[PDB]
Every structure is written in C-alpha cells, then in structure tokens.
Amino acid sequence: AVVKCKPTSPGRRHVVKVVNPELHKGKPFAPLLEKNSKSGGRNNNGRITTRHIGGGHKQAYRIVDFKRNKDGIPAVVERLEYDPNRSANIALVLYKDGERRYILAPKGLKAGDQIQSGVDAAIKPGNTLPMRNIPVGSTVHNVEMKPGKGGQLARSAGTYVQIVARDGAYVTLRLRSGEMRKVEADCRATLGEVGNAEHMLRVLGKAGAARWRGVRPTVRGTAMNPVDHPHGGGEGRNFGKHPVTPWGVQTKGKKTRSNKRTDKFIVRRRS
Amino acid sequence: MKRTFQPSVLKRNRSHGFRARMATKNGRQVLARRRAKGRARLTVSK
Amino acid sequence: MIREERLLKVLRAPHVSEKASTAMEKSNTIVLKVAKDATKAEIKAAVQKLFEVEVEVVNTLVVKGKVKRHGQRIGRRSDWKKAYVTLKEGQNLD
RNA sequence: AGGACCGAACCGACUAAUGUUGAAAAAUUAGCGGAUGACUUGUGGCUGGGGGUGAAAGGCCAAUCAAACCGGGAGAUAGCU
RNA sequence: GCUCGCCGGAAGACCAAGGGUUCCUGUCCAACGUUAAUCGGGGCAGGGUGAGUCGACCCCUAAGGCGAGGCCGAAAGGCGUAGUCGAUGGGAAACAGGUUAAUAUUCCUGUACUUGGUGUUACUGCGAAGGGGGGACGGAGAAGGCUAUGUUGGCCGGGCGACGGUUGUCCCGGUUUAAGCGUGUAGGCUGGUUUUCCAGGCAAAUCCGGAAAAUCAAGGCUGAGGCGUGAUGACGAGGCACUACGGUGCUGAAGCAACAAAUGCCCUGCUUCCAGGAAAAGCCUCUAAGCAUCAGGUAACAUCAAAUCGUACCCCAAACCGACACAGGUGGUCAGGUAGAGAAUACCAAGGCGCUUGAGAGAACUCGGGUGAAGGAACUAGGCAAAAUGGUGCCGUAACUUCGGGAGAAGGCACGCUGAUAUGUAGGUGAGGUCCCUCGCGGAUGGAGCUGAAAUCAGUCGAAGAUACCAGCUGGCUGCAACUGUUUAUUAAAAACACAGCACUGUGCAAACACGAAAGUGGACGUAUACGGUGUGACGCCUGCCCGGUGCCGGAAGGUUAAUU
Ligand SMILES: [Mg+2]
Ligand SMILES: [Mg+2]
Ligand SMILES: [Mg+2]
Ligand SMILES: [Mg+2]
Ligand SMILES: [Mg+2]
Ligand SMILES: [Mg+2]
Ligand SMILES: [Mg+2]
Ligand SMILES: [Mg+2]
Ligand SMILES: [Mg+2]
Ligand SMILES: [Mg+2]
Ligand SMILES: [Mg+2]
Ligand SMILES: [Mg+2]
Ligand SMILES: [Mg+2]
Ligand SMILES: [Mg+2]
Ligand SMILES: [Mg+2]
Ligand SMILES: [Mg+2]
Ligand SMILES: [Mg+2]
Ligand SMILES: [Mg+2]
Ligand SMILES: [Mg+2]
Ligand SMILES: [Mg+2]
Ligand SMILES: [Mg+2]
Ligand SMILES: [Mg+2]
Ligand SMILES: [Mg+2]
Ligand SMILES: [Mg+2]
Ligand SMILES: [Mg+2]
Ligand SMILES: [Mg+2]
Ligand SMILES: [Mg+2]
Ligand SMILES: [Mg+2]
Ligand SMILES: [Mg+2]
Ligand SMILES: [Mg+2]
Ligand SMILES: [Mg+2]
Ligand SMILES: [Mg+2]
Ligand SMILES: [Mg+2]
Ligand SMILES: [Mg+2]
Ligand SMILES: [Mg+2]
Ligand SMILES: [Mg+2]
Ligand SMILES: [Mg+2]
Ligand SMILES: [Mg+2]
Ligand SMILES: [Mg+2]
Ligand SMILES: [Mg+2]
Ligand SMILES: [Mg+2]
Ligand SMILES: [Mg+2]
Ligand SMILES: [Mg+2]
Ligand SMILES: [Mg+2]
Ligand SMILES: [Mg+2]
Ligand SMILES: [Mg+2]
Ligand SMILES: [Mg+2]
Ligand SMILES: [Mg+2]
Ligand SMILES: [Mg+2]
Ligand SMILES: [Mg+2]
Ligand SMILES: [Mg+2]
Ligand SMILES: [Mg+2]
Ligand SMILES: [Mg+2]
Ligand SMILES: [Mg+2]
Ligand SMILES: [Mg+2]
Ligand SMILES: [Mg+2]
Ligand SMILES: [Mg+2]
Ligand SMILES: [Mg+2]
Ligand SMILES: [Mg+2]
Ligand SMILES: [Mg+2]
Ligand SMILES: [Mg+2]
Ligand SMILES: [Mg+2]
Ligand SMILES: [Mg+2]
Ligand SMILES: [Mg+2]
Ligand SMILES: [Mg+2]
Ligand SMILES: [Mg+2]
Ligand SMILES: [Mg+2]
Ligand SMILES: [Mg+2]
Ligand SMILES: [Mg+2]
C-alpha cells in the first residue's frame, strides 16, 4: 500500500512509501545472485556516454528468468522478493524437479500459487505459453519479440500487453505505449499483468532519494555558458532559441526513429 | 596547504617507470630520445 | 648438497666489532661477512666444512652501503651480507 | 524514524582585525556553517586538450586555463616601440 | 643538579606513506645553524637493522590493466575471448620476561603453535580444468553479558615529620603476570537421525535440491568472558655488595577482594528499515575420466622443512609535501587521574618540551589584552567591532501553521557548604549460610559487605553558589529562495546551481541518445509505471487570448527541382 509519511522533518514531509508486507524480509536466493558493478554511465572508452548516472546503492543482480522454458513441469511460488534492479517484484518459484528460478511476479500471484509454462498449460495468471495458444483479447506480459529469445515487452511494474488480433503466423499486440505491433505467433508470453502496479504512486520526497537511486543531478542548458550548451549565455535569464539537446538537435517534437528494418512490424505508431 | 606533489612510489612507477615506457610506442620513443641525449637516469626507476 | 667450489666462495670474512665479540663470547655466535647471494643453508654448509664446526642456526641480514663524499664527488659504498652463525654448545672456534 | 536538533573530532570558510619585501605565492587569532549524510576520508583505478570533468563559477585539469604543459614548424608575422 | 614554566585525545607513545643512515659512539667547529657554540639532523671515522609464526614475497580475486587466436582499422593502432596481471579486500602459525651505546613478537630464557614433505605401522576408495556447500558481507537502533582500565578497602614494605598538630578513621610506595592447552559458560543459530524415490545442479554423483515415510525431543554448529593450568617460574617496592659515578652483580615482601566501567570483545549476533547491501581462492564435500589389490586417502609416530627480501631512525614532523631547521598540509592505532554529559574545557600523570639571538629601557605610534565617572548607537554606509546572553531541573510560553511545528518562543524561580531525614536513603551490585539438583561456569532463597544519586527540612558563610574554564542574545514588520545541500582552489556563498514535484517531447529494443573512420561500449544484463532531452522548481489557488512570424508535426494535388539519360 501507499503510505504518506508524517512531516517530522522537511524532506520527509512529501514522502510517500509503497510498502508491500508480502515481500520476503530476508536475504535473497544466493545461487541466482551475481555481481553487478556500477558504470557511472561511462563506456569502454571511459567517457561519460549517458549523463546523470552515478553512485547509488550497491546492488546484486538477481538472475530473472525471462525465457521461461521449463515446459510441462509445474512450479509453485515460494515467495515474492524485492529486486533492486527493476520496478517489478520478482517471485522465487520451485519446480517439482527441485530447480528454483526467479520470475517477474504477476498481479495476483502470491506464495503457494502454482504456475506452468508450455503449450498445454492452463490459461491462468503466471502461466506461460505461445501467443498462438493464448486467446485473443487477453492481457499478457513478458512478451517475446523473437521466438526463443526471452521476454522483452511489458516487464515494468504495472505493464501488460493486449493481444488484439491473430492473423496467420503473426499476432498484433497493443503495446503499453499505444503502438500496435505485429509479432510472430510462436513467440512466448506470460498471462496477466506484471505485479507492482502502485510503484508509480511512490514519491521520492527529497534530493537524497534520487541520489540513492544512482541518479546524479541534471543541469539546465539555459543555466550554462554558450560554450557548454546551445542554450547557454544571456545576461540574466535569456532563451531566444528553439529547444535542443546538448548536441544541437531539436527536443520538443522532432521524431528520431530511423529503423527501416522493423518499420514493417509496426502496424500503428503511438499517439 | 596540500601541495601538488604527494609522493607514492608505486604510483610513480606505474605512471612513469621503465616498464610503462616500454609498453607503448611513444614511451619507447621517449626512452630512445633520452638515450640519444645522454641521460644518466633514463627513467624514474630508482 | 652444495658444491665445494661454491662453498669456498660463499664466506668473505670474519666481522670484528664490539657486538660481534659479545656474540662470540656469550651466545657462541660468530659474525661473518658473506657473499650477498649466499643463502642461509649454503652459509651453514660453508661454516661446517670450512671451519669444521657444528652449526645450530644461521641468521642473515643485508647491510646497506653508506653514501660518502670524497672531496666534492658523491659516492656510495657497497651493500654486503652479514651472518650471525650460532654454533652448537661446546664448539670452540679458532 | 530523521538529507531531525545542540555539540567535539572530521569537513568547510560567513565576519574581523593582523599580515600584505608575510611565519605563509591565501595563513592567523577570535568568533562562524555542516557534523548519520545529496557526509567525510585512506589506498588503487578510469576519463586528455577544442579534449576531459563540471549540483554550471567559463569552475577545475600539477602555484599555469575563453582552450594545459613539453618539444617542433620557428629566426611565425610585427605598416608598432 | 636543584627550582620555575608549558603540552598531556598532545607539543606523549606506536605505525603506514614518504624519506633513505638522519640511528649509536668517538672526534672536529672553516662552512651549514638567522647570535655564540665546547653543541647539532653540520664535517670526518667507526659501529648498528638477526624472524617458520610481524610485513612483503606467496595463493585468491575487485575496480581496472595487458591480452594468443579473433573482430575492426591508410599505417601507427582500437576493442576484446581464452587467459594472465592487479589490494585498498579474502587466505596456516608466538607469547611473556631479560638484554644492546644503538635490533628485537627477529637475540637469549622459559613455555607454545603451524603446513609442508619424507619414512612408518595401521587401515582401505582414491581421483578434477567439473557439481554442491562454505567463505560471503548494508544502514540504523537496542540492550544484556563481558573485559581493557580505574577507584576504594584489605595485605606487604617503608615513614613518625625544617612551622602549631600528626602511633592514627594518619602519610608514601607496591599489590603485575601472557600466548598456548583444558574446561565450552552469558548468550546466538537451527529441529535431528534413518529409509525410499526423483524430468533439477551442461556428464556422473553416496553431495546439494525436491518429494514421501519412519522415529526421537535433544542434536549439532557458534560463542565473549570467567575458572583451571602455563607459574615451586618470571617480574616485583626497594634493600645489599662493587663502582671507569655510566652503571654492574647478588637479593627480593605482599602480590588479594569489592565496586565502577568503555566507543573495545560476544556481535560477520539480535531487532528493524529500504536505498536491498563484492569476488575468487584457501576450507569442507560429491563424484567423472582414470587406476585396481599399486598408488592415493586418515592414523598416529619419527625425522627433515620453512627459502628470499624488509627490520636502524624520523613519521602532525627540524628527517615526508611546502625553495628554508618555514606559525601551513599529512591516513591509521594507543586514550591514566580530579571535576564534567563528554575524545568539550580546566588543572595534572606517564612521557615530552621552554619553540637557536640575548641584555636593558619602560617615549610617540602599532599589535594583542584588562578596567573605566556620567551618558548608552548620539558612532557608522551599516551596532562593523566589542559588550551582553550562556548550565541542569521545575513552572510558563503568542501570532501564524503544511498540525510536525513555531518553541530553548518570550519570561521567571531554585542552585554553595554543613547537619538531619537515612552513624549512606531510593536504587545498583552481590559473599557466606540454608535448600534443590538432569551435578555444573547449575537453580532457588538469603541478605553481609561494597557502591550510591535526587529530594525535603533545619542551619551556615560570602557582595556574589550554573562562582573559574566552559556556556543561545531576544523580540517585531518585510523582500528573495520552499527546505538539507552545491558554487567562482586564491577579492563574489548569494536571490546563482541543485532539489523533490510538475509539464512537454522523443524513444518498441539491434530503443532513442552518447563515445567511437570502425569493431565495439555505455544506455541496460533495463523494456514505456522504462530510458533520453528540454523547460519549470516543495506545498496551496491557479496557469487566460494569439498558429500571422520562426521552429516542429502531418499532408501531398499542383508549381519548381540534382545526379542520371
Ligand atoms: Mg537524465
Ligand atoms: Mg528534473
Ligand atoms: Mg536542474
Ligand atoms: Mg552562468
Ligand atoms: Mg553554440
Ligand atoms: Mg532581461
Ligand atoms: Mg526578447
Ligand atoms: Mg631476515
Ligand atoms: Mg542532521
Ligand atoms: Mg551542529
Ligand atoms: Mg568548496
Ligand atoms: Mg577559525
Ligand atoms: Mg588546447
Ligand atoms: Mg560569465
Ligand atoms: Mg591551476
Ligand atoms: Mg586556440
Ligand atoms: Mg614557416
Ligand atoms: Mg620573433
Ligand atoms: Mg598546564
Ligand atoms: Mg650524512
Ligand atoms: Mg644523534
Ligand atoms: Mg657526536
Ligand atoms: Mg655561527
Ligand atoms: Mg670562534
Ligand atoms: Mg652528524
Ligand atoms: Mg632463531
Ligand atoms: Mg603471517
Ligand atoms: Mg580482468
Ligand atoms: Mg585490450
Ligand atoms: Mg592479436
Ligand atoms: Mg592472480
Ligand atoms: Mg592489502
Ligand atoms: Mg594478508
Ligand atoms: Mg630505537
Ligand atoms: Mg565451488
Ligand atoms: Mg551494520
Ligand atoms: Mg577487571
Ligand atoms: Mg587483568
Ligand atoms: Mg610538620
Ligand atoms: Mg612541628
Ligand atoms: Mg595505599
Ligand atoms: Mg589463560
Ligand atoms: Mg624500529
Ligand atoms: Mg609527535
Ligand atoms: Mg627553529
Ligand atoms: Mg613545520
Ligand atoms: Mg580525560
Ligand atoms: Mg583539550
Ligand atoms: Mg626562535
Ligand atoms: Mg607599552
Ligand atoms: Mg572589556
Ligand atoms: Mg563608561
Ligand atoms: Mg570600580
Ligand atoms: Mg556605569
Ligand atoms: Mg553622524
Ligand atoms: Mg546615526
Ligand atoms: Mg558582531
Ligand atoms: Mg565578546
Ligand atoms: Mg522593498
Ligand atoms: Mg536556498
Ligand atoms: Mg565539492
Ligand atoms: Mg573566491
Ligand atoms: Mg568569501
Ligand atoms: Mg546494445
Ligand atoms: Mg528557474
Ligand atoms: Mg501560457
Ligand atoms: Mg506556425
Ligand atoms: Mg498555420
Ligand atoms: Mg514539411
């Protein structure tokens, strides 16, 4: 649930927590963990390639299963867990054969729930099956774009995709953006919405919170000198130019999709 | 006042020492130049 | 097994000094100048063969050379290895 | 509980007088701000010059910065002194 | 040498880094030392650094570096796989005393430990580049148990006072002892043991994981400290022999108890929070290829082994970074007493220093301080600077408010010492005795002794009792920025930047975008509740009209329009 924190200090006043009690209070499943060091938004050349990334808390990498290939073995959900690497919550499941995996926790899922991957599997939340097997009109998440690859669409805290149509070897998805997109019908998909839907109701409430999430501050181009950004300079507050990136490209409105290889799959762009 | 030079031997060696110089082409060139000049101490190496 | 030839080369001199004398008298320990490359075992071997005397143990150390000035010109003395060699109880050395 | 409060260490640098061929090429003494954090600090690492880095002052990049230093083109050119 | 003064969370002690002989001894005083110098971190000579257990090396890895092939690139070269390097992190082992002019966990004395071989007898499934476990981990908070350490008493040794008193409830000193081995406690974690099966752990697995079934409620792991031993020893106040006045040799009493007590240890624990908290080896275990009655494994016992390099000295400084013997800078560890909340402050201990020019004088003026009649901001751009306020407890406290605040609002009262309450209370601690007992570091009862606030009443001294040091000035109206933060190293700390929040806009994943002739990398092991860019800047009430201009978005009928032909 969302919880507005009492204003016992400024910087706590405007804080709203999203507190789920059903998460595992404990150390995560250590076999599925692995190291994940921070970039600082800097590439192999050592240059900053993406501004405003830096610091934040140490995090392990939970190895989430997005491919979801244990066909026919029924799994049972052991627990829901906090993943620092994503807006969703993950769920530690236990297959009948003794293997454990992390998956994206879907909306209704909780400890004890049984889930299943495969063509044969029951059309119920958390179950995973090819989109030719999934009924049209259903909400799905963790959608593969290429068969066998692993789920790429609808992974974020409260997302889901609608299967609007199945026309032969393809199905048309209504993506969360509003883009309608053709996808091969043999591509896999998990039933239902992804879990942590009140994630968006959280409000950080202070500068420090942002920092804790590894986000360094962002300086406004207009606050700079002309040598630094296109918006810089001016005595007092001036801004007599069309908005643009730090590299001079228009920012308010100018479209930047150039991919002519996948234009065929996009049925309708978002609006 | 913390002045600019704050010595550290390992750091010095890694930065400027013989092996570092050797490692790259420009470093090698520098060494060669030094040799030509007649430098007694070819590198920072003690 | 150290070579005879090697052994002969190892041991450079006896070291005369107050401390050395004291060591000799009290602790039955002789203070030698040895080759800088000479390991402890080798030194011991040399002692046993060349002085005919049982060795309890050898402690070594490296003495660093002093920097001196002969007139205007600066110059460093050589480093050299000192060895305290402790002889077994009752071993009297000439 | 807290980018909560008072306050030493620690980090800073608002006022003052002193110094200004200094004790010091930015310090002093007296007060002053922060002091569980967007904190501070050791060791090592990475980013290189129209390049880096910048909670943005054209700041900082070895007492050097509206384009570092070293060497070279080079005895640049100087209707000027 | 005797006084005096200063530091004492340091101006003391021990290290790292850095330096590199500055250490110690003798000797010399030209230069160096802001003066003299017999002295010196100066000159010259000699001496000095001892390790299986400390550190490096070594084994393991992090960020990152290099990188066979490889991919990419006019050349140079870039990126990167296998790998291999890389500590600031993980990995076996030593303590006490004694000694040098100068080293010591390194020498000596005592008492220990480790992991390797080799050989043994005893046994008999061993075996990895692989599987599993483990190592292995955050912040804050709270205690409880402890010790370091200190205080008092007892004990032991010495003392009987340069001036009134001082054979006592008097004075001074000491009262120390390790690792190791054994015990396995306060306490923490977990249900164990056996059997059967199984699409999992790249193959196999007797291991792990998962299913069942049986049976027993104690099983195991962890763990400070204490106690015992170690120790008939060592050390020991000071006494006693020699004396090159440096010291050397002999000798040696007591060596207990209580209370207080860490920020250290149990604790890598527990509780809790969200921001969700390295890796790999050593270590344990499982098997595969294999070998097969051999090796290898564990078992004690014997023996051999542990090389190499560092070890002086300075290390908040006269030895390092600052040109200087420079008011500067410099990470870690140690942390006594009285007062105190305290690592603040004051005075002291241990220990270390008086800052390498002195001597006079006692003008103006300058610096740093003290006090000041009457007035009290009249000063001045401005109360700048000074002055003042300043503690604990209790009473009391407005507007306004986002209901948290405002607030330590404001303002007041009490405060010492003595006695009594109470030859020391409330509390804390807790010995004998007595009882129980699955027997121990056990449980009950018991209260000796020890420690010990706070209050009330009564008296009492002073001008003054938070007496020194230490230690808020307060209130009223108002601009700006919500707030904590950041910034021009060295004339600007702000109203500037940032900020949570808001909006627009791009981006469907080989994402947009960015760094790269490219390969590739970041974005992100993220996927539209996400990421980028732009503006605005908490919260509240809001955010009007204009698309002609310039941009952007969409359109494509016509006009115009490149290479090409
Ligand atoms: Mg951003
Ligand atoms: Mg923003
Ligand atoms: Mg901004
Ligand atoms: Mg500006
Ligand atoms: Mg421009
Ligand atoms: Mg203007
Ligand atoms: Mg205008
Ligand atoms: Mg040695
Ligand atoms: Mg605070
Ligand atoms: Mg404060
Ligand atoms: Mg600053
Ligand atoms: Mg000051
Ligand atoms: Mg340039
Ligand atoms: Mg400007
Ligand atoms: Mg500079
Ligand atoms: Mg230029
Ligand atoms: Mg020319
Ligand atoms: Mg010229
Ligand atoms: Mg004093
Ligand atoms: Mg010298
Ligand atoms: Mg000396
Ligand atoms: Mg001398
Ligand atoms: Mg002189
Ligand atoms: Mg003279
Ligand atoms: Mg000298
Ligand atoms: Mg020895
Ligand atoms: Mg060791
Ligand atoms: Mg690497
Ligand atoms: Mg490479
Ligand atoms: Mg190659
Ligand atoms: Mg290695
Ligand atoms: Mg290390
Ligand atoms: Mg180590
Ligand atoms: Mg010494
Ligand atoms: Mg393993
Ligand atoms: Mg913690
Ligand atoms: Mg004690
Ligand atoms: Mg003790
Ligand atoms: Mg008297
Ligand atoms: Mg008298
Ligand atoms: Mg006494
Ligand atoms: Mg013991
Ligand atoms: Mg030493
Ligand atoms: Mg000191
Ligand atoms: Mg001086
Ligand atoms: Mg100094
Ligand atoms: Mg104290
Ligand atoms: Mg003090
Ligand atoms: Mg002086
Ligand atoms: Mg005067
Ligand atoms: Mg005054
Ligand atoms: Mg007056
Ligand atoms: Mg008077
Ligand atoms: Mg008056
Ligand atoms: Mg006037
Ligand atoms: Mg006036
Ligand atoms: Mg003032
Ligand atoms: Mg004052
Ligand atoms: Mg006004
Ligand atoms: Mg502000
Ligand atoms: Mg800063
Ligand atoms: Mg400034
Ligand atoms: Mg200033
Ligand atoms: Mg990519
Ligand atoms: Mg603004
Ligand atoms: Mg408007
Ligand atoms: Mg328009
Ligand atoms: Mg129009
Ligand atoms: Mg157009």
Side-chain angles (χ1 to χ4, degrees):
Chain A
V2 302
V3 182
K4 182 91 188 168
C5 295
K6 294 196 164 191
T8 52
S9 48
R12 212 75 163 76
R13 173 168 255 116
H14 300 295
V15 173
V16 169
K17 295 178 155 186
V18 168
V19 177
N20 186 20
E22 303 262 61
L23 291 189
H24 180 54
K25 292 179 175 177
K27 301 296 174 190
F29 194 64
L32 284 173
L33 295 187
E34 92 167 47
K35 183 183 125 225
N36 177 46
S37 183
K38 297 177 167 293
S39 156
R42 292 158 159 84
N43 72 341
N44 61 13
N45 290 339
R47 302 290 194 73
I48 285 167
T49 53
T50 159
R51 283 111 54 74
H52 318 324
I53 301 177
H57 203 290
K58 184 137 67 181
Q59 296 168 329
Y61 185 67
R62 316 307 194 271
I63 292 160
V64 167
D65 168 26
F66 299 104
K67 269 218 279 188
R68 193 70 188 286
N69 312 322
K70 282 266 189 198
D71 300 346
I73 306 154
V76 53
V77 175
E78 293 215 292
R79 63 191 189 211
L80 310 185
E81 272 191 34
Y82 181 88
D83 189 357
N85 295 282
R86 54 182 86 267
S87 75
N89 277 129
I90 62 180
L92 184 62
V93 320
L94 181 52
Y95 287 93
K96 258 57 178 177
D97 66 359
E99 187 165 330
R100 318 194 149 68
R101 269 125 172 265
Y102 284 132
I103 69 175
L104 268 34
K107 199 174 161 185
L109 202 81
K110 57 192 179 188
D113 287 32
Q114 276 210 47
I115 63 176
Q116 197 162 37
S117 29
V119 165
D120 65 324
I123 297 150
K124 94 178 236 309
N127 286 35
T128 297
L129 42 141
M131 281 181 290
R132 57 179 53 265
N133 301 128
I134 289 167
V136 171
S138 61
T139 54
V140 242
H141 68 293
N142 190 60
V143 185
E144 295 191 330
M145 289 166 132
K146 284 190 169 190
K149 196 163 169 181
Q152 281 185 282
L153 313 153
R155 273 124 123 281
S156 201
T159 59
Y160 62 94
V161 194
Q162 273 156 247
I163 306 189
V164 302
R166 162 158 69 252
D167 51 307
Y170 288 83
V171 307
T172 303
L173 284 315
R174 204 202 294 283
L175 299 199
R176 202 71 183 73
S177 56
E179 184 145 319
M180 286 266 217
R181 198 192 195 284
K182 244 140 183 160
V183 161
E184 291 172 48
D186 254 301
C187 294
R188 225 145 181 89
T190 307
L191 272 305
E193 270 151 296
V194 96
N196 185 25
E198 66 182 342
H199 164 83
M200 63 174 169
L201 280 348
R202 88 199 344 293
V203 32
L204 274 15
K206 57 164 188 183
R211 297 314 301 270
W212 298 337
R213 293 144 166 91
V215 177
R216 299 197 75 248
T218 301
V219 180
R220 305 174 342 270
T222 194
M224 306 182 168
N225 294 312
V227 75
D228 313 310
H229 200 280
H231 291 174
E235 291 281 293
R237 306 197 173 99
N238 298 343
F239 190 74
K241 33 235 171 184
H242 303 109
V244 280
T245 56
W247 309 283
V249 181
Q250 189 84 24
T251 50
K252 299 282 173 43
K254 190 215 195 303
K255 295 171 165 68
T256 75
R257 161 167 247 253
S258 183
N259 196 230
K260 220 138 61 174
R261 173 182 89 259
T262 64
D263 271 325
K264 69 191 165 217
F265 300 137
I266 311 318
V267 172
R268 211 202 314 99
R269 301 280 290 158
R270 61 123 215 301
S271 294
Chain B
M1 305 182 68
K2 191 187 187 191
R3 285 280 126 78
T4 52
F5 186 60
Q6 295 285 331
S8 182
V9 174
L10 168 75
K11 219 186 282 190
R12 157 152 273 223
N13 278 331
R14 282 185 176 175
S15 186
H16 304 305
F18 177 83
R19 295 202 87 250
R21 288 275 141 88
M22 234 50 197
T24 177
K25 183 268 289 181
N26 282 310
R28 274 198 290 290
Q29 275 193 330
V30 155
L31 283 203
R33 272 215 301 286
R34 285 184 83 75
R35 280 219 184 74
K37 185 128 167 167
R39 288 303 184 172
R41 291 76 138 285
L42 204 270
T43 42
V44 183
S45 276
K46 296 265 286 182
Chain C
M1 222 300 122
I2 304 83
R3 195 149 156 202
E4 290 181 298
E5 176 165 315
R6 180 43 202 279
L7 283 180
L8 290 147
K9 290 182 172 187
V10 160
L11 293 177
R12 289 292 94 182
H15 185 57
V16 316
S17 157
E18 190 193 65
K19 178 169 188 182
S21 304
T22 304
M24 245 211 267
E25 100 179 26
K26 275 188 200 191
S27 302
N28 203 344
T29 296
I30 47 173
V31 187
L32 311 155
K33 193 185 291 315
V34 305
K36 202 174 189 302
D37 94 302
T39 187
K40 268 172 184 174
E42 276 180 344
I43 283 160
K44 174 166 155 181
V47 166
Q48 279 182 350
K49 199 193 172 210
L50 273 48
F51 292 65
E52 295 122 38
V53 66
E54 287 185 309
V55 169
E56 193 166 11
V57 64
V58 179
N59 284 207
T60 55
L61 64 78
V62 176
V63 181
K64 311 305 183 283
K66 284 183 176 174
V67 171
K68 295 281 169 172
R69 293 182 62 78
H70 190 86
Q72 282 182 320
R73 215 175 272 121
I74 198 173
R76 195 151 177 288
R77 293 158 175 218
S78 285
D79 294 11
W80 63 273
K81 201 165 185 173
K82 194 170 172 171
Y84 294 92
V85 184
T86 307
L87 307 163
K88 289 190 191 176
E89 60 186 309
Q91 284 294 354
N92 198 69
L93 224 199
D94 64 320

